[PDB]
Amino acid sequence: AIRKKLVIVGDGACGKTCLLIVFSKDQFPEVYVPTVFENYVADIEVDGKQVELALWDTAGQEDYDRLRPLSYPDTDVILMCFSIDSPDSLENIPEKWTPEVKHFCPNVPIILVGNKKDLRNDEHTRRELAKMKQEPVKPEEGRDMANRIGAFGYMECSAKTKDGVREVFEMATRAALQ
Ligand SMILES: Nc1nc2c(ncn2[C@@H]2O[C@H](COP(=O)(O)OP(=O)(O)O)[C@@H](O)[C@H]2O)c(=O)[nH]1
Ligand SMILES: *[C@H]1O[C@H](CO)[C@@H](O)[C@H](O)[C@H]1NC(C)=O
């Protein structure tokens, strides 16, 4: 049975747990899904192959710099997340998450994921970000960061609408396999 360990990282509130939840809920047959993910085993089928994806969430540990990395050994793929409603979350990709992940997970493939894409054209978030002299992340900034950090790929998604979620995990699975 092919098993791959997936760790999701990124700033607090950038949507890591909701992303795992939407994906996990999409499994068939339908199962009851918990609200915490550590070696959570999800079954996926990708290009005719059954894969056990063991999901680890760093939500709740984003400030535990010494404890969080204990989860990194044997990781096969990384979902590195920022939120499209938070340019600050994007800046932490090269400043915090990428040096960390490359240190503890050398040569482990990274999927760069822009969560909450439904917020890009959200009138309320535009207003809030404007108070800080910021605006939503544009797709091209996401793509350029992916190249900059050497990510396997860049994907945008919304856990709210579910758009792009499937494809995030398909890409992560292919990367873990390859
Ligand atoms: N609009 C929108 N909100 C989201 C999305 N994903 C998560 N959220 C909300 O953003 C907040 C943080 O999500 P969570 O998954 O707990 O982030 P975490 O801190 O990285 O685990 C919660 O209020 C979520 O309901 C999304 O795709 N779109
Ligand atoms: C399972 O999910 C429900 C929401 O769907 C939540 O109320 C419950 O606390 C969760 N149980 C566990 C063990 O995560």
Author numbering: 3 to 180
Sentences from the paper on this structure:
Rho GTPases control cell shape, polarity and motility by regulation of the actin cytoskeleton. Afp18 mediates toxicity via a glycosyltransferase domain that disrupts RhoA GTPase-dependent actin organization. We find that non-reversible glycosylation at a highly conserved tyrosine residue is responsible for the loss of RhoA activity. Taken together, we found that Afp18 is a mono-O-glycosyltransferase, which selectively uses UDP-GlcNAc as sugar donor substrate to modify Rho GTPases site-specifically at a switch I tyrosine residue.
To identify the site of modification and gain insights into the structural alteration caused by GlcNAcylation of RhoA, we crystallized Afp18-modified RhoA in the presence of magnesium and GDP and solved the X-ray structure at 2.0 Å resolution. Interestingly, despite the presence of magnesium in the crystallization conditions, the structure revealed an unusual GDP-bound but magnesium-free conformation. The overall fold of the crystal structure of GlcNAcylated RhoA is very similar to known structures of Rho GTPases. Tyrosine-34 is located within the effector loop region conserved in all Rho family GTPases. The defined electron density of the sugar attached to the hydroxyl group of tyrosine-34 revealed the α-anomeric configuration of the glycosidic bond. This finding implies that the glycosylation mechanism proceeds under retention of the stereochemistry of D-α-GlcNAc. We assume that steric constraints of the attached GlcNAc-residue results in the distorted conformation, which is incompatible with regulator and effector interaction.
